Short mmCIF file of C-alpha atoms in Angstrom, two decimals:
data_model
loop_
_atom_site.label_atom_id
_atom_site.label_comp_id
_atom_site.label_asym_id
_atom_site.label_seq_id
_atom_site.Cartn_x
_atom_site.Cartn_y
_atom_site.Cartn_z
CA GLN Q 1 49.31 122.09 147.46
CA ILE Q 2 47.38 122.86 144.28
CA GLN Q 3 44.34 125.04 144.91
CA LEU Q 4 41.55 126.58 142.85
CA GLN Q 5 39.40 129.28 144.46
CA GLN Q 6 36.31 130.10 142.42
CA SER Q 7 34.02 133.08 141.97
CA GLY Q 8 31.31 133.84 144.50
CA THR Q 9 27.60 133.23 144.21
CA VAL Q 10 25.88 135.12 141.40
CA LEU Q 11 22.14 135.66 140.94
CA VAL Q 12 21.09 136.92 137.52
CA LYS Q 13 17.97 137.67 135.52
CA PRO Q 14 17.02 135.51 132.52
CA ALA Q 15 18.68 136.03 129.12
CA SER Q 16 21.66 137.88 130.62
CA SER Q 17 25.20 136.49 130.74
CA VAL Q 18 27.77 135.98 133.50
CA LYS Q 19 31.51 135.32 133.78
CA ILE Q 20 33.03 133.28 136.60
CA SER Q 21 36.69 132.76 137.41
CA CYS Q 22 38.93 129.96 138.68
CA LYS Q 23 42.15 131.26 140.25
CA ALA Q 24 44.93 128.67 139.95
CA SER Q 25 47.91 128.38 142.30
CA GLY Q 26 50.51 125.72 143.06
CA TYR Q 27 51.32 124.43 139.55
CA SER Q 28 52.46 125.77 136.19
CA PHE Q 29 49.21 127.30 134.97
CA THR Q 30 49.95 126.66 131.28
CA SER Q 31 51.20 123.09 131.77
CA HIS Q 32 47.82 121.44 132.45
CA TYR Q 33 44.38 121.92 130.93
CA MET Q 34 41.55 123.54 132.88
CA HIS Q 35 38.29 121.62 132.57
CA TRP Q 36 34.89 122.94 133.61
CA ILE Q 37 32.06 120.94 135.18
CA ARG Q 38 28.37 121.82 135.50
CA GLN Q 39 26.09 120.33 138.15
CA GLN Q 40 22.41 121.24 138.01
CA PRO Q 41 20.49 121.28 141.32
CA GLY Q 42 19.98 117.69 142.44
CA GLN Q 43 21.64 116.35 139.28
CA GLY Q 44 24.87 114.71 138.17
CA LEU Q 45 28.09 116.04 136.70
CA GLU Q 46 28.65 117.24 133.14
CA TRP Q 47 31.92 118.14 131.46
CA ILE Q 48 31.59 121.49 129.68
CA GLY Q 49 34.99 121.64 127.98
CA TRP Q 50 38.63 122.44 128.53
CA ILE Q 51 41.14 125.18 127.77
CA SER Q 52 44.90 125.03 127.47
CA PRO Q 53 46.23 128.18 129.20
CA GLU Q 54 49.50 128.03 127.23
CA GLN Q 55 47.97 128.95 123.87
CA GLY Q 56 44.32 129.66 124.71
CA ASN Q 57 43.20 126.52 122.86
CA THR Q 58 39.67 125.43 123.75
CA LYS Q 59 37.75 122.19 123.27
CA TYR Q 60 34.07 121.84 124.07
CA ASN Q 61 31.21 119.54 124.83
CA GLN Q 62 28.80 119.70 121.90
CA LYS Q 63 25.92 120.38 124.31
CA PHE Q 64 27.44 123.65 125.58
CA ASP Q 65 28.47 125.06 122.18
CA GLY Q 66 27.35 128.68 122.14
CA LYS Q 67 26.47 128.55 125.85
CA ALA Q 68 29.93 128.62 127.46
CA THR Q 69 33.09 130.36 126.24
CA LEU Q 70 36.34 129.53 128.03
CA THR Q 71 39.14 132.05 128.49
CA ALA Q 72 42.45 132.09 130.33
CA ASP Q 73 44.87 134.80 131.47
CA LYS Q 74 48.33 133.32 131.95
CA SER Q 75 49.33 136.80 133.11
CA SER Q 76 47.15 136.33 136.21
CA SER Q 77 46.99 132.50 136.28
CA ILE Q 78 43.18 132.81 136.21
CA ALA Q 79 40.74 130.75 134.15
CA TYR Q 80 37.39 132.13 133.05
CA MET Q 81 34.07 130.78 131.83
CA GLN Q 82 31.30 132.98 130.45
CA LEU Q 83 27.75 131.68 130.27
CA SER Q 84 25.57 133.64 127.87
CA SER Q 85 21.82 133.80 127.20
CA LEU Q 86 21.06 132.46 130.65
CA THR Q 87 17.90 130.45 131.15
CA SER Q 88 16.59 128.46 134.11
CA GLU Q 89 18.25 125.32 132.72
CA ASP Q 90 21.55 127.12 133.36
CA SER Q 91 20.94 127.52 137.10
CA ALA Q 92 23.69 125.23 138.41
CA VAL Q 93 26.97 124.92 140.29
CA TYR Q 94 30.05 125.16 138.09
CA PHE Q 95 33.40 123.62 138.99
CA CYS Q 96 36.85 124.06 137.50
CA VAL Q 97 39.26 121.12 137.57
CA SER Q 98 42.91 120.68 136.64
CA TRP Q 99 44.90 117.45 136.72
CA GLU Q 100 48.49 116.76 137.76
CA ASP Q 101 49.79 113.18 137.49
CA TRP Q 102 46.39 111.49 137.89
CA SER Q 103 45.41 113.80 140.76
CA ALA Q 104 42.40 116.05 140.17
CA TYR Q 105 42.15 119.40 141.94
CA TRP Q 106 38.60 120.73 142.15
CA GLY Q 107 37.43 124.25 142.78
CA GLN Q 108 34.90 124.75 145.55
CA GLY Q 109 32.21 125.61 143.00
CA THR Q 110 30.30 128.70 141.88
CA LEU Q 111 26.53 128.83 142.38
CA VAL Q 112 24.66 130.34 139.43
CA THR Q 113 20.93 130.84 139.99
CA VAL Q 114 18.80 132.27 137.18
CA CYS Q 115 15.46 133.72 138.27
CA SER Q 116 12.20 132.76 136.58
CA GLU Q 117 2.57 142.40 135.28
CA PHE Q 118 0.92 141.51 138.59
CA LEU Q 119 2.94 144.09 140.51
CA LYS Q 120 1.90 147.41 138.94
CA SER Q 121 -1.56 147.15 140.47
CA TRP Q 122 0.18 147.50 143.84
CA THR Q 123 1.16 150.77 145.45
CA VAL Q 124 4.84 150.70 146.43
CA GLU Q 125 4.04 150.89 150.15
CA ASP Q 126 1.62 148.04 149.51
CA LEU Q 127 4.47 146.29 147.68
CA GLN Q 128 6.94 146.63 150.57
CA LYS Q 129 4.31 145.05 152.81
CA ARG Q 130 4.28 142.21 150.29
CA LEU Q 131 8.08 142.06 150.46
CA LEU Q 132 8.19 141.62 154.24
CA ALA Q 133 5.35 139.07 154.00
CA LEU Q 134 7.61 136.67 152.07
CA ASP Q 135 9.85 135.92 155.06
CA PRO Q 136 7.06 134.25 157.12
CA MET Q 137 6.35 132.23 153.95
CA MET Q 138 9.98 131.20 153.49
CA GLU Q 139 10.41 130.42 157.19
CA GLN Q 140 7.41 128.09 157.01
CA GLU Q 141 8.94 126.38 153.97
CA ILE Q 142 12.26 126.18 155.83
CA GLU Q 143 10.49 124.89 158.94
CA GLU Q 144 9.00 121.98 157.00
CA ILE Q 145 12.57 121.01 156.06
CA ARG Q 146 13.70 121.39 159.68
CA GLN Q 147 10.71 119.31 160.79
CA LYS Q 148 11.63 116.49 158.41
CA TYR Q 149 15.23 116.48 159.60
CA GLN Q 150 14.29 116.72 163.27
CA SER Q 151 12.37 113.47 162.77
CA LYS Q 152 15.33 111.94 160.93
CA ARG Q 153 17.47 113.08 163.87
CA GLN Q 154 15.26 111.64 166.61
CA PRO Q 155 16.26 107.94 166.31
CA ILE Q 156 19.94 108.91 166.49
CA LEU Q 157 19.36 111.14 169.52
CA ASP Q 158 17.38 108.38 171.24
CA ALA Q 159 20.07 105.79 170.49
CA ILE Q 160 22.77 108.08 171.91
CA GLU Q 161 20.62 108.54 175.01
CA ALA Q 162 20.02 104.80 175.42
CA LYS Q 163 23.78 104.13 175.42
CA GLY D 1 48.00 111.79 133.50
CA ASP D 2 44.65 113.51 132.97
CA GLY D 3 41.37 111.84 133.89
CA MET D 4 39.46 114.06 131.43
CA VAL D 5 41.72 113.96 128.34
CA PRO D 6 41.21 111.07 125.88
CA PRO D 7 44.11 109.51 123.95
CA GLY D 8 44.41 111.10 120.52
CA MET G 1 28.73 108.74 119.62
CA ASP G 2 28.55 110.00 123.19
CA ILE G 3 29.31 107.24 125.67
CA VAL G 4 26.47 106.47 128.08
CA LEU G 5 27.39 105.41 131.62
CA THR G 6 24.62 103.56 133.46
CA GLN G 7 24.71 103.39 137.25
CA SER G 8 21.87 102.75 139.67
CA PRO G 9 20.59 105.84 141.52
CA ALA G 10 20.59 104.43 145.06
CA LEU G 11 22.44 101.96 147.27
CA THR G 12 21.33 101.26 150.84
CA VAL G 13 24.00 99.31 152.74
CA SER G 14 24.31 98.53 156.43
CA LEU G 15 27.16 100.13 158.35
CA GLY G 16 30.31 98.02 158.19
CA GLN G 17 29.31 95.77 155.28
CA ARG G 18 30.56 95.73 151.71
CA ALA G 19 29.05 98.24 149.27
CA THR G 20 29.42 97.80 145.51
CA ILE G 21 28.71 100.60 143.05
CA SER G 22 28.20 99.45 139.46
CA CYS G 23 28.90 101.39 136.27
CA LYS G 24 27.88 100.11 132.84
CA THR G 25 29.16 101.71 129.64
CA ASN G 26 27.42 101.35 126.28
CA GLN G 27 30.86 101.34 124.61
CA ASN G 28 34.22 99.73 125.25
CA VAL G 29 36.50 102.21 127.03
CA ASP G 30 39.63 100.04 127.27
CA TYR G 31 42.62 101.45 125.38
CA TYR G 32 45.95 99.59 125.33
CA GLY G 33 45.67 97.68 128.59
CA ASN G 34 43.96 100.49 130.50
CA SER G 35 40.29 101.38 130.91
CA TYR G 36 39.26 105.02 131.11
CA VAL G 37 36.71 104.95 133.92
CA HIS G 38 37.29 107.09 137.01
CA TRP G 39 35.41 107.25 140.29
CA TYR G 40 34.45 110.24 142.42
CA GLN G 41 32.80 110.79 145.78
CA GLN G 42 30.64 113.86 146.41
CA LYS G 43 29.29 114.54 149.85
CA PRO G 44 26.32 116.92 150.18
CA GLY G 45 27.45 120.52 149.92
CA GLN G 46 30.98 119.52 148.89
CA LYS G 47 32.97 119.34 145.68
CA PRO G 48 33.61 116.00 143.95
CA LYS G 49 36.71 114.08 145.00
CA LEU G 50 38.65 111.54 142.95
CA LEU G 51 38.85 108.04 144.45
CA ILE G 52 39.93 105.75 141.60
CA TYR G 53 41.49 106.49 138.22
CA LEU G 54 41.85 104.11 135.27
CA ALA G 55 39.38 101.61 136.77
CA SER G 56 41.60 100.08 139.44
CA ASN G 57 44.07 102.69 140.74
CA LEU G 58 43.72 104.29 144.17
CA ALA G 59 44.21 108.06 144.26
CA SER G 60 46.47 109.96 146.64
CA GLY G 61 45.45 109.97 150.29
CA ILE G 62 42.40 107.80 149.62
CA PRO G 63 41.76 105.10 152.26
CA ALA G 64 42.37 101.43 151.57
CA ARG G 65 38.72 100.44 152.07
CA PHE G 66 38.00 101.90 148.61
CA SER G 67 38.83 99.73 145.61
CA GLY G 68 37.83 99.72 141.96
CA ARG G 69 37.76 96.98 139.37
CA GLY G 70 36.25 96.20 136.00
CA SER G 71 36.98 96.01 132.29
CA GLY G 72 35.39 96.59 128.89
CA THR G 73 31.84 97.72 129.67
CA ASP G 74 31.43 96.59 133.30
CA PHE G 75 33.03 98.31 136.29
CA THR G 76 32.53 98.34 140.04
CA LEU G 77 33.65 100.52 142.93
CA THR G 78 33.86 98.68 146.25
CA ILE G 79 33.81 100.18 149.75
CA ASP G 80 34.69 97.60 152.38
CA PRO G 81 33.96 98.26 155.16
CA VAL G 82 31.38 101.03 154.74
CA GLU G 83 31.99 103.74 157.32
CA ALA G 84 29.69 106.41 158.74
CA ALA G 85 31.63 108.99 156.73
CA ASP G 86 30.99 107.24 153.41
CA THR G 87 27.38 108.31 152.84
CA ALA G 88 27.65 110.30 149.61
CA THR G 89 26.96 110.25 145.88
CA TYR G 90 29.46 108.33 143.75
CA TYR G 91 30.08 108.93 140.06
CA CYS G 92 31.74 107.01 137.27
CA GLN G 93 33.30 109.05 134.47
CA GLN G 94 34.73 107.94 131.14
CA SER G 95 37.70 109.55 129.39
CA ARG G 96 38.07 107.17 126.45
CA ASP G 97 36.43 109.57 123.99
CA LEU G 98 35.21 113.13 123.95
CA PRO G 99 32.98 114.36 125.38
CA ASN G 100 33.87 113.15 128.86
CA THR G 101 30.68 111.71 130.32
CA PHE G 102 29.60 110.88 133.86
CA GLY G 103 27.09 108.45 135.23
CA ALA G 104 23.97 109.80 136.90
CA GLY G 105 25.43 108.91 140.30
CA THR G 106 24.65 106.40 143.05
CA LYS G 107 23.51 107.83 146.38
CA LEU G 108 24.80 105.65 149.21
CA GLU G 109 22.76 105.54 152.41
CA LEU G 110 22.81 103.41 155.55
CA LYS G 111 20.22 100.88 156.68
CA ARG G 112 18.56 101.66 160.02
CA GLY G 113 16.36 98.74 160.91
CA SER G 114 12.73 97.84 161.20
CA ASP G 115 12.44 99.70 164.52
CA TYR G 116 15.77 101.48 163.94
CA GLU G 117 17.21 98.30 165.44
CA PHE G 118 20.65 98.74 163.89
CA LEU G 119 21.25 102.20 165.46
CA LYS G 120 21.30 100.75 168.97
CA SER G 121 23.84 98.23 167.68
CA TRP G 122 25.99 101.16 166.52
CA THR G 123 28.88 102.61 168.49
CA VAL G 124 28.50 106.05 170.04
CA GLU G 125 31.05 107.58 167.66
CA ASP G 126 29.20 106.22 164.61
CA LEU G 127 25.86 107.65 165.76
CA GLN G 128 27.60 110.97 166.44
CA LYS G 129 28.87 111.13 162.86
CA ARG G 130 25.40 110.18 161.59
CA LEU G 131 23.91 112.96 163.71
CA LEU G 132 26.20 115.52 162.07
CA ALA G 133 25.88 114.09 158.55
CA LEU G 134 22.26 115.29 158.53
CA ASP G 135 23.25 118.97 158.60
CA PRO G 136 24.83 119.18 155.09
CA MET G 137 21.80 117.47 153.54
CA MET G 138 19.43 119.78 155.41
CA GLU G 139 21.43 122.90 154.53
CA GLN G 140 21.35 121.97 150.83
CA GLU G 141 17.55 121.77 150.90
CA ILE G 142 17.37 124.97 152.95
CA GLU G 143 19.63 126.84 150.52
CA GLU G 144 17.33 125.86 147.63
CA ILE G 145 14.39 127.45 149.44
CA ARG G 146 16.63 130.42 150.23
CA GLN G 147 17.75 130.62 146.60
CA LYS G 148 14.11 130.43 145.49
CA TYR G 149 13.05 133.22 147.84
CA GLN G 150 15.94 135.39 146.65
CA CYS G 151 14.38 135.18 143.20
CA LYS G 152 10.81 135.63 144.44
CA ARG G 153 11.68 139.02 145.94
CA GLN G 154 13.78 140.63 143.21
CA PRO G 155 10.71 141.46 141.04
CA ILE G 156 9.12 143.14 144.07
CA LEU G 157 12.34 145.05 144.71
CA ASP G 158 12.79 145.76 141.00
CA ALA G 159 9.22 147.07 140.90
CA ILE G 160 9.93 149.77 143.49
CA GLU G 161 13.12 151.21 142.00
CA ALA G 162 11.36 151.24 138.62
#
């Protein structure tokens, strides 16, 4: 039972840098490479690069050169990826994968969201009013989603009922 | 057998 | 010379019929009697899962209704029959040369009917799985809005502490 549990959700400000981890169990950590995959929101899969935990050797996708640095601690059987100079294009879900005999074991994924002055005019008590006013906004945005899916649901619910 | 490692 | 994998974005198939995902490579990926195209399935909110490796080989614990075939530049993944569980995004990936490259992905969805005619044909269990398959897709869209509103508020909260 090979398993890879990944780092939790991180939310960062632009131009900072973050490190996420992939904890490997169930196989000889140094025997197989650890690849990393990036999936942007609503997009496909991209292979960032791999590391060999035995010697720390790294190979990279040319697109991520200078964006991702891969590290490994055979002491702790943990793999690491650091993403530096974060921009909105780097908001994504990042997976770690390792292969044993044509079986691929995927981590559950780490969600990296990079956020993208008007506010000094406001008093801070005025600003906290603004803060609580966002939730009715978000709920209305969420409700539009719920409304779309309630309509997608309705034919199924009617067909169940007609049975 | 690695699905992400090319021969060579 | 990055290899480009071309696969159509969408496939709408009726429940229980054959579905065929296509992947086209701009370069030959065959190497000594084997072709380095692999297939994955990704359901909404889930990690990718390997289905086929080296074009034609079923992976461990993968059902028999999945099958892959193809050579040179042209490859297909075949689901027969298509089951209510199978709605997902399917990827082809090449490992002939670095960098490893994926296709854009084919979203598989199920036909419903002019007046949703096909749903009343469906069995109760199949509709029940379709009812629950909506939640992961909805939660993904809801989390985006939630992620967005996390970001919207941190300037306001940053503004107060400084």
